[PDB]
Structure 1
């Protein structure tokens, strides 16, 4: 009867840490998808900013020549 309590109590500990872990893991998994999307989005913008400032580099150069 006592041994039953020991194992039954472990079941409560196991069930508790299981639902808690899965609950946060699911929340984390969903969050990663949002962060990953933000990464892809920001990376895309950075690419547009990089190619733009580079276009100004060749633009400011040719203008400097015409000015000279």
Structure 2
């Protein structure tokens, strides 16, 4: 039991580090959305008065 638990330890340590980067990536997409919506809405208003 001791050896098998020790052997599986490296896998958890390495692909935890794998998870960490993808978190920040999806956060960056969540940032990218909003300012795209606001440029859309201001463009629509200017078009309307045209």
TM over 0.5: yes
1:60: which partner in 2?
A: 40
TM-score calculated relative to the size of structure 1: 0.54
Q: How many correspondences in the alignment? A: 48
Cα-Cα RMSD: 1.7
Rg: which structure is higher?
1
TM-score calculated relative to the size of structure 2: 0.67
2:18: which partner in 1?
A: 38
2:31 counterpart of 1:51: yes
What's the CA shift for 1:35?
2.0
Query: Gaps (5+ residues) in structure 1?
Result: 1-20
Query: Gaps (5+ residues) in structure 2?
Result: none
